Amino acid sequence: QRPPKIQVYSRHPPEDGKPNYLNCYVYGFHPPQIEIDLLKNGEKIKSEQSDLSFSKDWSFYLLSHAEFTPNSKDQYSCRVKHVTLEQPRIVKWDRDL
Amino acid sequence: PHPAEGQWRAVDVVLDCFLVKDGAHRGACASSEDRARASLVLKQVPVLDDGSLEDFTDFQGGTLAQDDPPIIFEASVDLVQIPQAEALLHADCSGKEVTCEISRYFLQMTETTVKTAAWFMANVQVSGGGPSISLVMKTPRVAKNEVLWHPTLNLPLSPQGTVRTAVEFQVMTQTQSLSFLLGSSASLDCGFSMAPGLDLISVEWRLQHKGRGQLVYSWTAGQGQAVRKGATLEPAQLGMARDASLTLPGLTIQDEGTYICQITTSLYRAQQIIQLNIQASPKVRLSLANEALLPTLICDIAGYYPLDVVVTWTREELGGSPAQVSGASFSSLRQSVAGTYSISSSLTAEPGSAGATYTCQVTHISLEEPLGASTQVVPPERR
Amino acid sequence: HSLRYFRLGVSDPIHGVPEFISVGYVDSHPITTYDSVTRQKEPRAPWMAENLAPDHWERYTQLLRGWQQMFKVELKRLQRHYNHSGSHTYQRMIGCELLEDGSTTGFLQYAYDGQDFLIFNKDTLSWLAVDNVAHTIKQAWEANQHELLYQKNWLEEECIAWLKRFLEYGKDTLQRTEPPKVRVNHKETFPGITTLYCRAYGFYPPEISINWMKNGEEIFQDTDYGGILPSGDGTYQTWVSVELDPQNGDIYSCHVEHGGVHMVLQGF
Ligand SMILES: CC(=O)Nc1nc2ncc(C=O)nc2c(=O)[nH]1
């Protein structure tokens, strides 16, 4: 087992009234059985997941992204599922504000 | 160890000797197997504290024997054993089982690396990653036009009895494993010896990491030279076993892996392989946000390695049924100037009706004991 | 310049774990992928599809299929050597590197359940081992000198030749580069403590460094360094931040450098 490491970030600086894109980078995981869920206020939003790439460190990389409209009143987060883990990992995003 | 110029007595040790079933192995391709066929003769020269037996000691009682099995190799000693003189004593003290293994330098499918001749090897290792030595030895047999005359210790060690052996070169270490902290200084432990009839060319130290073995230090013809980092002392002269240690400046992440100590002589070469792990212990700080109907718990866990320390929050009440928190969240996994990692975590607290206790617990391989911090949360109505 | 080939599978796969994966990379973008389900070689780059005839794609696929089958055989052999009756993972990695000064290198490593198993040293022509089985195999493989020239060429000749060809084939794309954009703000990460946070995004390749000055002098406190985070737009992101005291009324400047471009922020 290699527990995933997770970070969450925007593609461009979020701003109220200006729709944007939300990324999450999951790296250093193994085996490659990862599903990334991006959420707004705990609710799943439209998202896509890209290829799982190899690392030199016996691990894999994975990028996933979603579409959202920035809102300083709202909160954002990500949860990443892993077959070989009892519980998905929970990471908080500071909305890059 | 200081050279054994004090009070000591040599004792006779016998260890179970393994032999690979070459051509009859459990697997597909191997030159080693954990199955005994014979024993090796070993020498030990421990320093005596009592001398209760005058000219003997049971220091190595766990390995000492007087009874020779049907098959046993003389393993004559023409070189210095001192560095390992108490290797088996320390093993017995720790209760670590000791084994040994014999093999061959003879190749049939290709060119023999020692120019086809009756030369063999014998390894001795203490279980648990303890002291380890690789012996290079010869058998005084002669042939002209024969192919298998060595014999090749296969399948059987010999049609009868045992062939004579003598060690002319060996490489040894006190440990097969090292452990240091990230950012902390370190060293490698190894040494070697040889018969007077064998000269020394060079010694190399290499690091196994990132898919490649790379040189970090070399010593040749009296001259030491670093290519990445480290420093050595001049090898001893004949009469005492030679050092092959390496002093290492503060280690970083790149320096983690397995180190190899390679000794090349005028005739033969050998190496020991020592794994070096690096860790760092988390540090924890905790504070509660002021006011709010649901005060926020903020905790930072910093200065640890490797990354992704496990963090769990706990909630306890004044009785009832305390329980763990499977929620919370983490963020902000990053490195420090020291190369160490840091991570943040937070949790929304429920003050409860009469107050509640919250703890942030941290688990890591570098932590002998649980690490974390506690705080109380006081309801607005309990201020 | 990087070229990487990966091969991974599992001995008696369980829990839906992928049976066999093989993927190739150059620099900072995939070039090819193999699907072990339909048993097909596919491009991941437009200049791979261009500069490789259908004839080669089919031929390579058949080669990969052979390797897939033989790999599964290896997996069973490993269980025998490890004496493991359960299900276990195993993978190998190889590639090369071309340096600006014209020199070349490369690597070759194996792992068992994520643990270092064997590494080949092309320069000493020997194998490096960790655990008991690795030592068993080390001696066996070193004894067999017929692998000597093969293993050396495998790391050097095959990989380097491919890399140089790939660099030519994708020359129209592999020279892509973009400067970063920068944004700096303050935020609270811990009560009584203020964090000064710099984000940088939209740069390629990720040859970037961020640092801080305090009143014109080098900072003295610790510094939080992020990693390299794909944007999905062909570029990457990073970030660096420093911890400020609650009494820290000092002036900081943010330095962001990439691709020869140097930005210095006079305020936030
Ligand atoms: C001898 C050997 O195994 N070399 C080798 N050649 C390749 N040629 C093409 C591809 C991609 O389709 N992958 C490889 C690979 O992984 N290894």
Short mmCIF file of N, CA, C and O in Angstrom, two decimals, chain A residues 58, chain B residues 205-215 257-262 271-274, chain C residues 108-111 115-131 133-139 141-142:
data_model
loop_
_atom_site.label_atom_id
_atom_site.label_comp_id
_atom_site.label_asym_id
_atom_site.label_seq_id
_atom_site.Cartn_x
_atom_site.Cartn_y
_atom_site.Cartn_z
N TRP A 58 7.91 4.11 -7.82
CA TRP A 58 7.07 2.92 -7.66
C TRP A 58 5.61 3.29 -7.50
O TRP A 58 4.77 2.44 -7.20
N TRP B 205 32.77 3.61 -2.21
CA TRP B 205 31.47 3.65 -1.56
C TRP B 205 30.40 4.20 -2.50
O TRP B 205 30.56 5.27 -3.08
N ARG B 206 29.32 3.44 -2.66
CA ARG B 206 28.26 3.81 -3.59
C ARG B 206 26.90 3.81 -2.91
O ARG B 206 26.68 3.10 -1.94
N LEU B 207 25.99 4.63 -3.42
CA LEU B 207 24.62 4.68 -2.91
C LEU B 207 23.63 4.11 -3.93
O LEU B 207 23.64 4.50 -5.10
N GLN B 208 22.79 3.19 -3.48
CA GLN B 208 21.72 2.65 -4.31
C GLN B 208 20.43 3.43 -4.13
O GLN B 208 19.80 3.37 -3.07
N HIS B 209 20.02 4.16 -5.16
CA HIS B 209 18.80 4.96 -5.11
C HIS B 209 18.36 5.37 -6.50
O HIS B 209 19.17 5.49 -7.42
N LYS B 210 17.06 5.60 -6.66
CA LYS B 210 16.53 6.25 -7.85
C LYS B 210 16.95 5.51 -9.12
O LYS B 210 17.16 6.12 -10.17
N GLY B 211 17.07 4.19 -9.01
CA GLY B 211 17.17 3.34 -10.19
C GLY B 211 18.62 3.15 -10.61
O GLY B 211 18.91 2.41 -11.56
N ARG B 212 19.53 3.82 -9.92
CA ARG B 212 20.95 3.77 -10.25
C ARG B 212 21.81 3.73 -9.00
O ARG B 212 21.53 4.42 -8.02
N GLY B 213 22.85 2.90 -9.03
CA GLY B 213 23.93 2.99 -8.05
C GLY B 213 24.95 4.05 -8.45
O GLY B 213 25.47 4.03 -9.57
N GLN B 214 25.22 4.98 -7.54
CA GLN B 214 26.11 6.10 -7.83
C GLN B 214 27.24 6.18 -6.81
O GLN B 214 27.04 5.89 -5.63
N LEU B 215 28.42 6.58 -7.27
CA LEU B 215 29.56 6.79 -6.38
C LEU B 215 29.37 8.04 -5.53
O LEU B 215 28.94 9.08 -6.02
N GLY B 257 18.64 5.31 1.03
CA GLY B 257 18.75 4.15 0.16
C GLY B 257 19.69 3.10 0.76
O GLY B 257 19.82 3.00 1.98
N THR B 258 20.34 2.33 -0.10
CA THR B 258 21.21 1.25 0.34
C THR B 258 22.65 1.51 -0.09
O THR B 258 22.93 1.73 -1.27
N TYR B 259 23.57 1.48 0.88
CA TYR B 259 24.97 1.79 0.62
C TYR B 259 25.79 0.52 0.42
O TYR B 259 25.57 -0.48 1.10
N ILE B 260 26.74 0.58 -0.51
CA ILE B 260 27.59 -0.57 -0.79
C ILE B 260 29.06 -0.22 -0.60
O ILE B 260 29.55 0.77 -1.13
N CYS B 261 29.76 -1.05 0.17
CA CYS B 261 31.18 -0.84 0.43
C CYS B 261 32.04 -1.83 -0.34
O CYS B 261 32.10 -3.01 0.00
N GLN B 262 32.70 -1.34 -1.39
CA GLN B 262 33.36 -2.21 -2.35
C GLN B 262 34.87 -2.16 -2.19
O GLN B 262 35.48 -1.10 -2.29
N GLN B 271 32.24 -7.08 -1.52
CA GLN B 271 31.49 -5.95 -1.00
C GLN B 271 30.50 -6.38 0.07
O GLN B 271 30.06 -7.53 0.08
N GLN B 272 30.14 -5.46 0.96
CA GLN B 272 28.97 -5.62 1.80
C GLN B 272 27.89 -4.61 1.45
O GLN B 272 28.19 -3.51 0.98
N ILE B 273 26.63 -4.98 1.67
CA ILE B 273 25.51 -4.11 1.34
C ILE B 273 24.72 -3.74 2.59
O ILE B 273 24.20 -4.60 3.30
N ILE B 274 24.64 -2.44 2.87
CA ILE B 274 24.04 -1.95 4.10
C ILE B 274 22.93 -0.95 3.82
O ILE B 274 23.16 0.08 3.19
N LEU C 108 17.76 1.15 -14.37
CA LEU C 108 16.93 -0.05 -14.45
C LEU C 108 16.71 -0.66 -13.08
O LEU C 108 17.66 -1.05 -12.39
N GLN C 109 15.44 -0.75 -12.67
CA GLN C 109 15.10 -1.13 -11.31
C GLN C 109 13.89 -2.06 -11.29
O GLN C 109 13.02 -1.98 -12.15
N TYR C 110 13.85 -2.94 -10.29
CA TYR C 110 12.67 -3.76 -10.04
C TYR C 110 12.19 -3.60 -8.60
O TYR C 110 12.97 -3.29 -7.71
N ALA C 111 10.89 -3.82 -8.39
CA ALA C 111 10.30 -3.69 -7.06
C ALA C 111 9.34 -4.84 -6.78
O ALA C 111 8.72 -5.38 -7.70
N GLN C 115 8.56 -2.40 -2.72
CA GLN C 115 9.88 -2.40 -2.10
C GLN C 115 10.98 -2.64 -3.13
O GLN C 115 10.83 -3.46 -4.04
N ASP C 116 12.08 -1.91 -2.99
CA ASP C 116 13.23 -2.08 -3.87
C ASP C 116 13.66 -3.54 -3.93
O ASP C 116 13.89 -4.17 -2.89
N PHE C 117 13.77 -4.08 -5.14
CA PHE C 117 14.16 -5.47 -5.33
C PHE C 117 15.56 -5.57 -5.92
O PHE C 117 16.47 -6.12 -5.29
N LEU C 118 15.73 -5.04 -7.13
CA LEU C 118 17.02 -5.08 -7.81
C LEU C 118 17.27 -3.81 -8.60
O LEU C 118 16.34 -3.23 -9.17
N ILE C 119 18.52 -3.37 -8.64
CA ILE C 119 18.94 -2.33 -9.56
C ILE C 119 20.20 -2.74 -10.32
O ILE C 119 21.14 -3.28 -9.74
N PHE C 120 20.20 -2.48 -11.62
CA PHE C 120 21.36 -2.78 -12.46
C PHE C 120 22.29 -1.59 -12.57
O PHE C 120 21.86 -0.47 -12.88
N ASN C 121 23.58 -1.82 -12.33
CA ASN C 121 24.59 -0.78 -12.49
C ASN C 121 25.40 -1.00 -13.76
O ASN C 121 26.31 -1.82 -13.80
N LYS C 122 25.06 -0.25 -14.81
CA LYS C 122 25.63 -0.47 -16.13
C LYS C 122 27.12 -0.13 -16.15
O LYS C 122 27.86 -0.57 -17.03
N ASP C 123 27.55 0.66 -15.17
CA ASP C 123 28.91 1.19 -15.15
C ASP C 123 29.86 0.23 -14.44
O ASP C 123 31.05 0.20 -14.74
N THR C 124 29.32 -0.55 -13.51
CA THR C 124 30.10 -1.59 -12.85
C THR C 124 29.76 -2.97 -13.42
O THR C 124 30.43 -3.95 -13.12
N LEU C 125 28.71 -3.02 -14.23
CA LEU C 125 28.26 -4.28 -14.81
C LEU C 125 27.90 -5.29 -13.73
O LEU C 125 28.32 -6.45 -13.78
N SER C 126 27.13 -4.84 -12.74
CA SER C 126 26.73 -5.70 -11.64
C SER C 126 25.34 -5.33 -11.14
O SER C 126 24.75 -4.34 -11.57
N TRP C 127 24.81 -6.14 -10.22
CA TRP C 127 23.46 -5.94 -9.71
C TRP C 127 23.48 -5.56 -8.23
O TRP C 127 24.34 -6.02 -7.48
N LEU C 128 22.54 -4.72 -7.82
CA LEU C 128 22.40 -4.34 -6.42
C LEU C 128 21.11 -4.89 -5.82
O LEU C 128 20.06 -4.85 -6.46
N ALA C 129 21.20 -5.41 -4.60
CA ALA C 129 20.11 -6.18 -4.01
C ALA C 129 19.78 -5.68 -2.61
O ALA C 129 20.60 -5.01 -1.98
N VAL C 130 18.59 -6.00 -2.14
CA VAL C 130 18.15 -5.58 -0.81
C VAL C 130 17.79 -6.78 0.06
O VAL C 130 18.49 -7.09 1.02
N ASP C 131 16.70 -7.45 -0.29
CA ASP C 131 16.16 -8.52 0.54
C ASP C 131 16.72 -9.88 0.13
O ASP C 131 17.55 -9.97 -0.78
N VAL C 133 15.63 -12.61 -1.33
CA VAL C 133 15.39 -13.10 -2.69
C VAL C 133 16.19 -12.31 -3.71
O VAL C 133 16.73 -12.87 -4.66
N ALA C 134 16.25 -10.99 -3.52
CA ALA C 134 17.04 -10.13 -4.38
C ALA C 134 18.50 -10.56 -4.40
O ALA C 134 19.15 -10.55 -5.45
N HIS C 135 19.02 -10.94 -3.24
CA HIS C 135 20.38 -11.45 -3.13
C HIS C 135 20.53 -12.78 -3.86
O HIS C 135 21.54 -13.02 -4.52
N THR C 136 19.52 -13.63 -3.73
CA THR C 136 19.50 -14.91 -4.44
C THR C 136 19.55 -14.70 -5.95
O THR C 136 20.32 -15.37 -6.65
N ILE C 137 18.74 -13.78 -6.44
CA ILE C 137 18.67 -13.50 -7.87
C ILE C 137 19.89 -12.74 -8.35
O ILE C 137 20.42 -12.99 -9.43
N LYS C 138 20.35 -11.80 -7.53
CA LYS C 138 21.57 -11.05 -7.83
C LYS C 138 22.70 -11.97 -8.25
O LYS C 138 23.27 -11.81 -9.33
N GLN C 139 23.01 -12.94 -7.40
CA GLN C 139 24.13 -13.85 -7.65
C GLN C 139 23.91 -14.65 -8.92
O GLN C 139 24.84 -14.87 -9.70
N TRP C 141 22.06 -13.84 -11.57
CA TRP C 141 22.09 -13.00 -12.76
C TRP C 141 23.50 -12.52 -13.07
O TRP C 141 23.89 -12.42 -14.23
N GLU C 142 24.26 -12.22 -12.02
CA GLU C 142 25.65 -11.81 -12.17
C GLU C 142 26.51 -12.95 -12.68
O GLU C 142 27.41 -12.74 -13.50
#
